[PDB]
Amino acid sequence: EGLNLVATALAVGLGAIGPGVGIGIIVSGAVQAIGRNPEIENRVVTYMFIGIAFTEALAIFGLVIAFLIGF
Amino acid sequence: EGLNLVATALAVGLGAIGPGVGIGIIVSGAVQAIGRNPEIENRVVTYMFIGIAFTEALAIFGLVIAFLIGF
Amino acid sequence: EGLNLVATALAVGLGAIGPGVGIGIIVSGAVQAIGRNPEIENRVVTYMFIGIAFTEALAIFGLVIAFLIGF
Amino acid sequence: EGLNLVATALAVGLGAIGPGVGIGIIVSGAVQAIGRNPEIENRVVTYMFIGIAFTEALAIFGLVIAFLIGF
Amino acid sequence: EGLNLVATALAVGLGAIGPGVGIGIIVSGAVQAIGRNPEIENRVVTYMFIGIAFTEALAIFGLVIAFLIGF
Amino acid sequence: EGLNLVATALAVGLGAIGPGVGIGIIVSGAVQAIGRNPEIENRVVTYMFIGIAFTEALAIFGLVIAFLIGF
Amino acid sequence: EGLNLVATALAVGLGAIGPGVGIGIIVSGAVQAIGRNPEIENRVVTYMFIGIAFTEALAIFGLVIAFLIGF
Amino acid sequence: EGLNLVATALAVGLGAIGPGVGIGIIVSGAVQAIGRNPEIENRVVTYMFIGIAFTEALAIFGLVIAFLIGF
Amino acid sequence: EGLNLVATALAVGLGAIGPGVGIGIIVSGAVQAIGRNPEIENRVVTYMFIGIAFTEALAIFGLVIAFLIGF
Amino acid sequence: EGLNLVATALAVGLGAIGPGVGIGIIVSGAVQAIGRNPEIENRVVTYMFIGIAFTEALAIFGLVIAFLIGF
Amino acid sequence: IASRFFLYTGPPHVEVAAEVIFDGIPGFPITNSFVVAIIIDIFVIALAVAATRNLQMVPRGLQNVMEFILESLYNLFRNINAKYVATAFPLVATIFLFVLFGNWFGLLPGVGSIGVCHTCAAQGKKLVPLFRAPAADLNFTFAIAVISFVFIEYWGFRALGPGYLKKFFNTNGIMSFVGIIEFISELVKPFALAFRLFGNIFAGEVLLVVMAFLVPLLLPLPFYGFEVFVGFIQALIFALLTYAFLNIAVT
Amino acid sequence: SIASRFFLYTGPPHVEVAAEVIFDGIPGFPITNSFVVAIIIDIFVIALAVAATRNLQMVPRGLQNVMEFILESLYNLFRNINAKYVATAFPLVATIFLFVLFGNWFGLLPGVGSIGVCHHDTCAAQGKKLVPLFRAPAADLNFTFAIAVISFVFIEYWGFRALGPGYLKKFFNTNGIMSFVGIIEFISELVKPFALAFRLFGNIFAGEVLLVVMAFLVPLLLPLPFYGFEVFVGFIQALIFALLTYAFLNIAVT
Amino acid sequence: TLFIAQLINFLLLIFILRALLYRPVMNLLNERTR
Amino acid sequence: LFIAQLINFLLLIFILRALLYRPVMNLLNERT
Amino acid sequence: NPTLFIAQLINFLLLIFILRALLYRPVMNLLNERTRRIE
Amino acid sequence: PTLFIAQLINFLLLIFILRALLYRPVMNLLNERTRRIEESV
């Protein structure tokens, strides 16, 4: 039946909320730090884009398995 | 069977809860840092929009997956 | 069966918590910033509002899917 | 079948979870801003009411589908 | 077929979750502002009620659906 | 059928999770206000207790609905 | 049929998550206020303890519902 | 069927979710209090330990209920 | 029909969601505290360790119960 | 039957819900610590990487459980 | 008191659908959306020619209103970016004015009630609503979203060298792992715009229709106010997002 | 010695009874497995009190000092909570803490979950089933219900006496604020003693279940952190029960 | 038949908006003209 | 219908561009 | 019965409280003597 | 029963572990009480 479709739904929806709030927390902390001190932007930027990527990786898994259900 | 329809609803739902709190945190930190230091109001905007584009991609993927399984 | 009927209910109900908390934190942070500094009253109005739409858009997403299932 | 009652309950509950904390965050932010400085009362109240209006619009969006399920 | 019972139960529980944390953050912000400045007592608490009289009101709607199960 | 049992459990748990974090936030805010300024704790205590009662109303509503479903 | 086991599981799990974050925030605020000043530590410790008591009341209500369902 | 196994798993997981964020908030607040004038170390560690004692008490409640269902 | 697979899934997911949100707060609070001042330094470090250890126990259950289901 | 696919999807989704927000909090706190002052950057980056590894432990636990269920 | 007492007008009316093509008897058939779009274009042209027919110092009346609206938009766009505030002004300004009147047109009496058919609902006719909000259709909204995306890409390529495709598909290390989806997000920026604008007007008009079915009078007035508000917010925000995306692209 | 369960397998958690069990057969009211432990704890409390206060030495030393220190700490804490009502409630709140603490610690004593009378353990070989002996009174709902209702009656009486007729009906006549909160306050006070009893009931019960289960998994070096957690949480539960009772009294009067 | 209800609602909303927003909009327009 | 909508939007954009070029010039002259 | 068991437990708790009142009274007297010596 | 032996072993180990850390605190409390008594004079 549609259990594969349910699996795709669970994979795309659940597993995206985690990174969905993680991106926001990361960028908000970075923005607050950069506002309190703009003379350390570069380093901040680095610590931005790694962290995003890491939690983006958490999203990526929750994406790819869904495609693996699609086959 | 309507299992595809409930799967689509669940997919779009848990895909939508993902960004919302995230982007809220994004622009809340952005406006707070802007108020903290009005001098910096250009780089912060760019990084806030970059983070928004980072997080809303998950929601867009959930929406397009829901549409794909809805047709 | 009523599974299609409950699908619309999940579609509208889900993806409302995310944008709801997003709206909450957006307005809270913007009001905090404007309280700390009224001189930014223009900018804090602009950015927060577009953020509103972002969150709002997500909710609307789920809502439209409900109708996409309701009929 | 009785699943329509379950659908109404799901609609109202999942549409109530979001704005129920959203309006709380709105009021908390507005009251904190007022306590920080009691001179921006009118603008803060107006923006708080805008946020309340958006969140209650989400609540009504849930409510109308909850009623339509009974239809 | 006791779907009505789980329907009303889920309705009341999920209409009570949101307003609970909303009232919690409302009262926290209100008492924090009161501690910051006493003489604003009559004003901010009113907005608190303006928030609170909304929160539980929405909860009543969920409870109404519960009573609508008896209808 | 055993649907009454899951109904009661859903009622009590879903109507109890919200008030838990709500009362936690209420008392934490009152704690912070008292710690930073203990002279006005009486009004702070009164407002904290009325907020506790407000959310405990929802908690008791959920518990009573669970008990009614049980019998 | 085993649905009673699922009911007990739901009751205990919901009664567990509900106040855990609540008591965490309780003691976090209490220790923050203590760190701010140790002079009035006892008076505020009383309030944080009664807040913890209310949270435990909610949790153990959820627990005894599961116990009642089990028998 | 294996619905008993699902009940056990849901019980342990949803009994563990609450304490996970609980003790996190506890230790975050405790270390934050420590970082501000670390002179009240004994009191803050004692209060953090009793808080995590309550939190792990809820965790153990969930664990033992899951284990008893495993019987 | 394969309920043990979804049982293991529920166990792992619902027992890892707790630590996932917990540990981040646990060590992030200490990181910002030690950024505020590095004098106390490793004296605080062990705390997050044992704090992590605490939620690690939950994570252990989040595997162990699943490892019981899987084999 | 099909329960294996939804099991794997739920496992990855709820193994990504936790580490996502955990990584978000980790990077936010770490970058705030960077914004506080330099000359402590290396130590707090090491602590941030420790937290990232701790969350990635749960992430890979969920991923490997999903892969095992797929086999 | 103020009781409703509108059971006669409380008949079952929960009809909702996507864009409805009009008669289109000749070639290239038209829809109900593309007569409302035409009438909004006519209204905008009439307002512009009314503001343009008498231009002088010390603006007053309609001319002053047009100047204030245009100058507010100019200030808002300058606050984001001042270099392209004149190079991209006509597009964003046209986007705001066209959408806002289209959104407000759906609130006029007759929207969803005037049935083109072949109102006419007692019979077996389709009773297709003549007045359908142009922004509540996935054709006009998709067209404006795609033309905005084309404008962003062209001007994002007009002055960037071959460096526009440097933030994506780069070999800078970790920037690669974020460079692809950043482009992918850039791919979904128009779509996310369109589904944003199309749904919001559709959601509001369906809310108003449902509230009419629930209680015909005195119930939907706050929702009418909220919708006349949110329509202008959406119309402004679409142009604001277009300008912000252009600014982040040129930078 | 991690895999010592192979040599000594504890067996399934036979201790899962959610009610008191009569230990000695009596024609009238039987002595439950929790009642005998309550009597034993009372006897131990009497013995330690009569040992500490037999001589009443001026300078406290040894057991007298140990008994005096905890009582003085409780007195100071209650004085910190409320000023004038310490003496009116000190014996009840003091005995509600000491009595349940030893029973809580009695659960951690060896043989609490294994030693028992007949009606794979030992009695399974015989026809009569094996029931446990030494069950903590706090693990029984009857004892917790009794102490909770005693505390509820106490706070009701000392609120009625303190506020006269006002505590009889709070301020229901306000109709502006104390109109819906008053009934909310009343139902909160109604559910308070049930929560009090159930808190002590569940904590000790879950303690016994965890101790038995940990033996089933690995009965060597695994239940040691849990044993420490439980001996800590029993004392903490007794303390929070006493503090909660006194704080409820304090909010009742004021 | 919904046309009458829609017209009544639109007229009521227009009257409410005109009554509650004429003075501030007119003052803003006069200030902009000045 | 998407192509027709895009063409109509482009025509309206050109008309509004002419109208604004008149109004932007008027505003610039007023500023000077 | 369960009601009889609850009543018996309540009676035992009341007796324990009455007995501890004698113990608390000696402790109160000792504390008062210590305070008087401090005075 | 073997449960009794396991419980006895666990109780002995827990008692030893707890005493190894509580010997210092109980002795410290007794010393504080003795110091207060001496200060009473």
CB contact under 8 A, G30 and F25: no
The single-letter DSSP state of residue K56 is -
- Closest in J8, J22, J33 to I35, CB measured: J33
What is the full DSSP assignment across D14-38? HHHHHHHHHHHHHHHHHHHHHHH-T
Q: Which resolution, in Å, applies to this structure?
A: 4.0
């999920």: which residue's tokens? E14
Q: Domain count of chain J?
A: 1
In the structure encoding, which two tokens stand for residue A9, read together? 């739904």
Chains K and D touch (3+ CB pairs under 8 A): yes
Q: How far apart are CA C63 and CA B12, in angstroms?
A: 10
Domain boundaries, position C54: 3-70
Q: Which residue has the tokens 């958006």?
A: D54
Evaluate the CA torsion angle K11, K15, K20, K25 in order and state its sign.
negative
| CA pair distance F20, F28, nearest whole angstrom | 12
Which backbone phi and psi does F33 adopt, to 5 degrees?
A: -65, -40
Interatomic CA distance for residues L128 and L144, integer angstroms: 30
- Find the helix or strand (DSSP H, E) in which B12 lies: helix B3-36
Name the one residue in this structure whose structure tokens are 């936690």. F24
- 3-class secondary structure, K111: strand
Asked whether the beta carbons of L113 and L132 are under 8 A apart, the reply is yes
Tell me the two tokens of residue L134. 């030494």
Q: Say which residue the tokens 């008594």 belong to.
A: P37
Neighbour tally for H5: CB within 10 Å: 25
Tokens found for residue O9: 């437990």
Task: Kindly report the number of other CB atoms within 10 A of residue K117's CB atom.
Answer: 16
Q: Is the Cβ–Cβ distance between L199 and G60 less than 8 Å?
A: yes
Q: Are K84 and K247 contacting, i.e. CB atoms less than 8 angstroms apart? A: yes
Residues L72, O34: contact at Cβ < 8 Å?
A: no
Whole-angstrom distance, CA of residue G20 vs CA of residue H54: 9
Of the candidates F26, K85, H55, K152, the residue with the CA atom closest to the CA atom of residue I19: H55
Residue L12 falls in which region: left (phi positive, over 0), alpha (psi -120 to 50) or beta: beta
CA I71 to chain centre: 23
In degrees, to the nearest 5, what angle opens at C-alpha L217 toward C-alphas L216 and L223? 90
As a whole number of angstroms, the distance between CA H68 and CA K171 comes to 55
We report the CATH number of the domain holding residue B38 as 1.20.20.10
Task: Write out the DSSP string of L139-208.
Answer: GSHHHHHHHHHHHHHHHHHHHHHHHTTHHHHTTTT-SSSTTTHHHHHHHHHHHHHHHHHHHHHHHHHHHH
- Closest to F34 in 3D by CA, of E35, D29, I13: E35
Whether the CB-CB separation of A51 and J49 falls below 8 Å is answered with: no
List all residues 6 or more positions away from P10 whose beta carbon is below 8 Å from its beta carbon.
Answer: L110, L215, L219, L220, L223, L224, L227
The CA dihedral of P26, P32, P35, P36, to the nearest 10 degrees, is -120
Distance CA H56, CA F48 (A): 27
Query: Nearest CA of chain H to the CA of G41: how many Å?
Result: 10
Task: Determine the Cα–Cα distance for residues O13 and F66; give it in Å rounded to an integer.
Answer: 33
K and G touch per CB criterion (3+ pairs under 8 A): no
Q: Residue P30: which H helix or E strand, with range? A: helix P2-40
Q: Which chains touch P (3 or more CB pairs under 8 A)?
A: L, O
Contact between chains at J16 and A69 (C-beta distance less than 8 A): no
Identify whether the C-beta of residue A71 lies closer than 8 Å to the C-beta of residue A61.
Answer: no
CB-based contact (8 Å) between N8 and chain K? Answer: yes
Q: Which residue has the tokens 């994979």?
A: A11
CA I62 distance to own-chain centroid: 10
CA distances from D70 to C10, D61, H43, K7 (A): 15, 15, 57, 18
Which residue has tokens 């014996």?
L91
- The angle that helices L86-107 and L141-163 make with each other, rounded to 10 degrees, is 170
Cross-chain Cβ contact K237/C50 below 8 Å: yes
Q: G4-13 b/e with 16+ CB inside 10 Å = b?
A: bbbbbbbbbb
CB-based contact, P27 to chain L, within 8 Å: no
SS3 state at L32: strand
Spatial CB neighbours of L119, under 8 Å, sequence gap ≥ 6: L128, L129, L130, L131
- Chain G, 8-67: which have a CB under 8 Å from a chain L CB? 42-43, 46, 49-50, 52-53, 56-57, 60-61, 63-64, 67
Cβ of J65 under 8 Å from any chain I Cβ?
Answer: yes
For residues J49 and J31, is the Cβ–Cβ distance under 8 A?
no
* I6 touches J10 (CB < 8 A): yes
Please give the DSSP secondary-structure letter assigned to residue L23.
E
Nearest one of L233, L242, L215 to L10, comparing CA atoms: L215
- Burial class from Cβ neighbours inside 10 Å (0-12, 13-18, 19+) for residue F13 reads buried
- Give the Cβ contact number of residue K69 at 10 Å: 15
Does residue B45 contact residue A13 with C-beta atoms inside 8 Å? no
Task: List all residues 6 or more positions away from K106 whose beta carbon is below 8 Å from its beta carbon.
Answer: K131, K132, K133, K136, K201, K204, K205, K231
List beta partners, residue K131: K111
Tokens of P7: 């419980």
Contact B20, C20 (CB under 8 A): yes
Q: Which of B5, B19, B24 sits opposite C7 (nearest CB)?
A: B5
Instruction: Determine the straight-line distance between the first and last CA of chain L, rounded to whole angstroms.
Output: 58
Are E55 and D10 a contacting pair at CB < 8 A? Answer: no
Smallest Cα–Cα separation from I17: which of J21, D12, L186?
Answer: J21
Please, how many CA atoms are within 13 Å of residue O24, restricted to the half-sphere of its CB? 20
d(CA A19, CA A55) in angstroms, rounded, equals 5
> What count of residues does chain N have?
32
| CA dihedral for J16, J18, J20, J23, sign (positive or negative) | negative
Q: Is J64 on the interface with I (CB under 8 A)?
A: no
Report the number of secondary-structure helices (H) and strands (E) in chain G. 2, 0
Contact criterion met (CB < 8 Å) for F50 and L181 = yes
Buried b (16+ CB within 10 A) or exposed e, H49-60: ebbbbbbbbbbb
On whether any CB of chain B is under 8 Å from the CB of C70, the answer is no
Q: What is the CA radius of gyration of chain G?
A: 16
Virtual torsion, Cα G20, G25, G31, G37, nearest 10 deg: -160
In sequence order, which ranges of I1-71 are alpha helices (DSSP H)?
3-36, 42-70
- Whether residue A5 contacts residue B69, with contact meaning beta carbons closer than 8 Å, is answered with yes
Judge whether D6 and E5 are in contact, CB under 8 Å: no
User: Could you give the 3-state DSSP secondary structure of residue K11?
Assistant: coil
Alpha-carbon gap, residue D35 to K110, rounded angstroms: 48
CB C58 within 8 A of CB C48: no
State how far the alpha carbon of K12 is from the alpha carbons of B28, D71, G14, K218, in Å.
43, 9, 41, 18
Asked if N25 is an interface residue toward chain K (Cβ–Cβ < 8 A), one would say no
Q: Which residues neighbour E7 within 8 Å (Cβ) at sequence distance 6 or greater? A: D2, D5, D6, D8, D9, E69
What is the total residue count of chain D? 71
The one-letter amino acid code at L80 reads N
Q: Which of O16, D47, J19, G53 is nearest to L236 (CA)?
A: G53
Chains E and M make contact, 3+ CB pairs within 8 Å = no
Six-digit token string for K119 = 């109102």
- How far away is chain L from the Cα of F57, in angstroms, using its nearest Cα? 6
Buried b (16+ CB within 10 A) or exposed e, I12-35: bbbbbbbbbbbbbbbbbbbbbbbb
Which two three-digit tokens encode residue L203? 């904590």
Beta carbons of I51 and H56 less than 8 Å apart: no
Handedness of CA L194, L200, L204, L207 (dihedral sign): positive
First to last CA, chain O: 55
- Take residue D23 and report the two structure tokens written for it: 């309006």
* DSSP line for F2-70: THHHHHHHHHHHHHHHHHHHHHHHHHHHHHHHHHH--TTHHHHHHHHHHHHHHHHHHHHHHHHHHHHHH
Alpha-carbon separation of residue K101 from K94, K197, L129 (angstroms): 11, 14, 84
Q: Does G64 touch chain H (CB under 8 A)?
A: no
